[PDB]
Design an enzyme around this catalytic site. Structure first.
Site, PDB file in Angstrom:
ATOM      1  N   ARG A   1       0.874  -0.817   0.283  1.00  0.00           N
ATOM      2  CA  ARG A   1       0.151  -0.147   0.140  1.00  0.00           C
ATOM      3  C   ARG A   1       1.424   1.242  -0.057  1.00  0.00           C
ATOM      4  O   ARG A   1       2.108   0.817  -0.245  1.00  0.00           O
ATOM      5  CB  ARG A   1      -0.989   0.379   1.217  1.00  0.00           C
ATOM      6  CG  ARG A   1      -1.812  -1.063   1.393  1.00  0.00           C
ATOM      7  CD  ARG A   1      -3.453  -0.234   1.818  1.00  0.00           C
ATOM      8  NE  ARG A   1      -3.712  -1.336   3.809  1.00  0.00           N
ATOM      9  CZ  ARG A   1      -3.827  -0.514   4.863  1.00  0.00           C
ATOM     10  NH1 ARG A   1      -4.937   0.587   4.388  1.00  0.00           N
ATOM     11  NH2 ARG A   1      -4.310  -1.711   5.359  1.00  0.00           N
ATOM     12  N   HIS A   2       0.045   2.327  -0.067  1.00  0.00           N
ATOM     13  CA  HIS A   2       0.599   3.816   0.054  1.00  0.00           C
ATOM     14  C   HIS A   2       1.842   3.815   1.228  1.00  0.00           C
ATOM     15  O   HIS A   2       0.947   3.015   2.304  1.00  0.00           O
ATOM     16  CB  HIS A   2      -0.168   4.651  -0.725  1.00  0.00           C
ATOM     17  CG  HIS A   2      -1.715   3.965   1.002  1.00  0.00           C
ATOM     18  ND1 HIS A   2      -1.455   4.893   1.540  1.00  0.00           N
ATOM     19  CD2 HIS A   2      -2.353   3.613   0.509  1.00  0.00           C
ATOM     20  CE1 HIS A   2      -2.531   4.591   2.037  1.00  0.00           C
ATOM     21  NE2 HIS A   2      -3.593   3.746   1.511  1.00  0.00           N
TER      22      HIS A   2
ATOM     23  N   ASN B   1      -5.616   8.234   7.273  1.00  0.00           N
ATOM     24  CA  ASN B   1      -5.528   7.078   8.014  1.00  0.00           C
ATOM     25  C   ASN B   1      -5.137   6.961   9.585  1.00  0.00           C
ATOM     26  O   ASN B   1      -5.950   6.401   9.765  1.00  0.00           O
ATOM     27  CB  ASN B   1      -4.028   6.056   6.899  1.00  0.00           C
ATOM     28  CG  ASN B   1      -4.708   5.093   5.969  1.00  0.00           C
ATOM     29  OD1 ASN B   1      -5.356   5.005   5.717  1.00  0.00           O
ATOM     30  ND2 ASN B   1      -3.364   5.045   4.912  1.00  0.00           N
TER      31      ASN B   1
ATOM     32  N   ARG C   1      -2.045   9.637  -2.221  1.00  0.00           N
ATOM     33  CA  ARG C   1      -1.126   8.870  -1.383  1.00  0.00           C
ATOM     34  C   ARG C   1       0.561   7.485  -2.233  1.00  0.00           C
ATOM     35  O   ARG C   1       0.979   7.800  -2.090  1.00  0.00           O
ATOM     36  CB  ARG C   1      -2.338   8.420  -0.567  1.00  0.00           C
ATOM     37  CG  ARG C   1      -3.225   7.307  -0.857  1.00  0.00           C
ATOM     38  CD  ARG C   1      -3.751   7.186   0.146  1.00  0.00           C
ATOM     39  NE  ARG C   1      -5.033   6.454  -0.041  1.00  0.00           N
ATOM     40  CZ  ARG C   1      -6.176   7.118  -0.680  1.00  0.00           C
ATOM     41  NH1 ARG C   1      -6.234   8.231  -1.180  1.00  0.00           N
ATOM     42  NH2 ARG C   1      -6.899   5.975  -0.294  1.00  0.00           N
TER      43      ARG C   1
ATOM     44  N   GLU D   1      -8.456   3.207  -4.951  1.00  0.00           N
ATOM     45  CA  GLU D   1      -9.284   2.716  -3.783  1.00  0.00           C
ATOM     46  C   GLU D   1     -10.407   2.323  -4.098  1.00  0.00           C
ATOM     47  O   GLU D   1     -11.107   3.205  -4.879  1.00  0.00           O
ATOM     48  CB  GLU D   1      -8.692   3.046  -2.738  1.00  0.00           C
ATOM     49  CG  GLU D   1      -8.883   2.478  -1.678  1.00  0.00           C
ATOM     50  CD  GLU D   1      -8.567   0.775  -1.131  1.00  0.00           C
ATOM     51  OE1 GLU D   1      -8.964   0.262  -2.365  1.00  0.00           O
ATOM     52  OE2 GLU D   1      -8.278   0.358  -0.078  1.00  0.00           O
TER      53      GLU D   1
ATOM     54  N   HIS E   1      -3.761   0.709  -2.797  1.00  0.00           N
ATOM     55  CA  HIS E   1      -4.370   0.782  -1.509  1.00  0.00           C
ATOM     56  C   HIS E   1      -5.134  -0.650  -1.080  1.00  0.00           C
ATOM     57  O   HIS E   1      -5.082  -1.966  -1.624  1.00  0.00           O
ATOM     58  CB  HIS E   1      -6.234   1.092  -2.665  1.00  0.00           C
ATOM     59  CG  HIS E   1      -5.669   2.124  -2.903  1.00  0.00           C
ATOM     60  ND1 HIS E   1      -5.533   3.385  -1.650  1.00  0.00           N
ATOM     61  CD2 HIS E   1      -5.116   2.670  -4.147  1.00  0.00           C
ATOM     62  CE1 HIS E   1      -5.100   4.235  -2.859  1.00  0.00           C
ATOM     63  NE2 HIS E   1      -4.686   4.044  -3.804  1.00  0.00           N
TER      64      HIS E   1
HETATM   65  N1  LIG Z   1     -17.243  -1.192  10.059  1.00  0.00           N
HETATM   66  C1  LIG Z   1     -16.761  -1.289  10.170  1.00  0.00           C
HETATM   67  N2  LIG Z   1     -16.032  -0.670   8.676  1.00  0.00           N
HETATM   68  C2  LIG Z   1     -14.619   0.214   8.691  1.00  0.00           C
HETATM   69  C3  LIG Z   1     -13.865   0.694  10.169  1.00  0.00           C
HETATM   70  N3  LIG Z   1     -12.986   0.696   9.529  1.00  0.00           N
HETATM   71  C4  LIG Z   1     -13.189   1.260   8.021  1.00  0.00           C
HETATM   72  N4  LIG Z   1     -14.242   0.220   8.008  1.00  0.00           N
HETATM   73  C5  LIG Z   1     -14.521   0.508   6.679  1.00  0.00           C
HETATM   74  O1  LIG Z   1     -15.500  -1.287   6.168  1.00  0.00           O
HETATM   75  C6  LIG Z   1     -15.202  -1.604   4.523  1.00  0.00           C
HETATM   76  C7  LIG Z   1     -14.586  -2.831   4.607  1.00  0.00           C
HETATM   77  O2  LIG Z   1     -13.302  -3.151   5.760  1.00  0.00           O
HETATM   78  P1  LIG Z   1     -11.935  -3.711   5.617  1.00  0.00           P
HETATM   79  O3  LIG Z   1     -11.997  -4.810   5.373  1.00  0.00           O
HETATM   80  O4  LIG Z   1     -11.336  -3.162   7.177  1.00  0.00           O
HETATM   81  O5  LIG Z   1     -11.299  -2.801   4.366  1.00  0.00           O
HETATM   82  P2  LIG Z   1     -11.622  -2.122   3.231  1.00  0.00           P
HETATM   83  O6  LIG Z   1     -12.636  -2.773   2.643  1.00  0.00           O
HETATM   84  O7  LIG Z   1     -10.040  -2.602   2.347  1.00  0.00           O
HETATM   85  O8  LIG Z   1     -11.985  -1.062   2.895  1.00  0.00           O
HETATM   86  P3  LIG Z   1     -11.360   0.276   2.547  1.00  0.00           P
HETATM   87  O9  LIG Z   1     -10.873   0.901   3.611  1.00  0.00           O
HETATM   88  O10 LIG Z   1     -12.790   0.740   1.464  1.00  0.00           O
HETATM   89  O11 LIG Z   1     -10.380   0.185   1.393  1.00  0.00           O
HETATM   90  C8  LIG Z   1     -15.162  -0.311   4.111  1.00  0.00           C
HETATM   91  O12 LIG Z   1     -15.361   0.554   3.776  1.00  0.00           O
HETATM   92  C9  LIG Z   1     -13.460   0.635   5.431  1.00  0.00           C
HETATM   93  O13 LIG Z   1     -13.382   1.903   4.860  1.00  0.00           O
HETATM   94  C10 LIG Z   1     -14.021  -0.262  11.041  1.00  0.00           C
HETATM   95  O14 LIG Z   1     -13.973  -0.318  12.396  1.00  0.00           O
HETATM   96  N5  LIG Z   1     -16.230  -0.649  11.268  1.00  0.00           N
END
Ligand SMILES: Nc1nc2c(ncn2[C@@H]2O[C@H](COP(=O)(O)OP(=O)(O)OP(=O)(O)O)[C@@H](O)[C@H]2O)c(=O)[nH]1
Ligand SMILES: Nc1nc2c(ncn2[C@@H]2O[C@H](COP(=O)(O)OP(=O)(O)OP(=O)(O)O)[C@@H](O)[C@H]2O)c(=O)[nH]1
Lengths: 191, 191
Positions: free
Chosen positions: A8-9, A15, A58, A78, A143
């Protein structure tokens, strides 16, 4: 033998600040990782490595620290969170309470209002994967959601395992495609 | 008729910044919720209301806005994140990648390094559940994990679904136990 480096970046402002998506720059620590990455790469002694990034600031700022030309891809951008862009998990629970849980039923096919899903992202990445196959040595500075889809491809992971693949910040996954499939080594750069 | 008004403390500084645990105070918006909550309570016309809070600054600060006496309970303190105290979910994934994955296998029994689990918190909440049971009209200004455990007890939810119950900020849940179990009334206080 060719190998694909995925990471990732560097850590971004958002973040560090606790927020998802957006288009923030690198934090002080993020910039440090960019220099650590440059050091790691040079350490590898790769023959003509091609650096790929997305359009996000980023990824670009990280590549800038490599002092080598990089190709930008709009497909490596992303996943779009839509309405809950630049929001925290708490803000999402508060302002979009049912969506938060809807996701738990199917995180692969779940789509945020006005945004993408992991299924969408997998499709949007098709062109990149195609090119990734045509290349020798490549470093894709991307990302989280993107790196997961890319990783899932090379490691033949199911759509279920995909949304849960380990893609932390400052960790470089070196994939080495081999006869039986694809080898992987995890390199954590502490800064 | 008797109701148990379960609600989370008003938004804390750490909540706004992306971090779990800690002992931060209410943000300006959190303070605003404290006042909204006070206005709501009066509108209820409740008789001899008992306010219970934890020893955390965030719950105390919310109670103060009510202008009524309240008793503090250490048992109501939020679940200890141990070594992950005040970290973001990215910092955890980066410095504790294996821990993060392990938690996803069993969110109920997962215990933080040098900290506790939902199972540990349940045991800790036993005397709270008892007094709360034998009490009349009671307002409990607590935390996320704590509110989930309490809610699961009155709604007879399994330990399995316990960690996924909806406990967003600035939302007071009016719980009125009645023959077939317990009735809920979700009150969102927009600030
Ligand atoms: N429900 C929840 N979602 C979170 C949290 N932190 C980040 N997310 C968001 O939950 C979704 C998926 O979570 P993850 O699998 O951890 O990460 P990701 O799908 O790669 O999400 P991106 O952040 O878009 O990369 C994404 O939209 C995240 O940004 C948290 O504490 N709770
Ligand atoms: N790893 C990670 N932990 C999170 C996130 N959001 C909250 N947490 C913490 O992860 C643990 C379990 O998450 P949740 O079930 O959403 O909330 P909780 O268990 O009530 O958390 P506490 O806030 O510790 O009560 C808790 O210690 C949370 O503080 C996130 O996006 N990622």
């Amino acid at each position: 033998m060719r190998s694909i480096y995925l990471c990732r970046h560097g850590e971004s402002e958002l973040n560090l600040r606790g927020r998802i998506g957006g288009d923030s720059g690198l934090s002080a620590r993020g910039k440090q990782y960019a220099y650590a990455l440059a050091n790691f790469i040079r350490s590898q002694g790769i023959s003509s490595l091609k650096v790929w990034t997305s359009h996000m600031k980023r990824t670009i700022q990280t590549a800038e620290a490599l002092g080598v030309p990089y190709e930008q891809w709009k497909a490596l951008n992303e996943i779009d969170a839509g309405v809950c862009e630049e929001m925290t998990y708490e803000e999402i629970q508060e302002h979009y309470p049912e969506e938060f849980a809807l996701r738990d039923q199917d995180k692969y096919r779940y789509r945020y209002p006005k945004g993408e899903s992991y299924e969408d992202l997998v499709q949007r990445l098709e062109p990149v994967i195609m090119e990734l196959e045509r290349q020798e040595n490549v470093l894709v500075i991307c990302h989280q959601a993107v790196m997961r889809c890319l990783l899932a491809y090379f490691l033949d992971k199911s759509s279920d395992e995909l949304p849960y693949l380990k893609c932390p910040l400052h960790t470089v996954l070196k994939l080495t495609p081999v006869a039986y499939g694809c080898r992987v080594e995890s390199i954590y750069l502490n800064v």
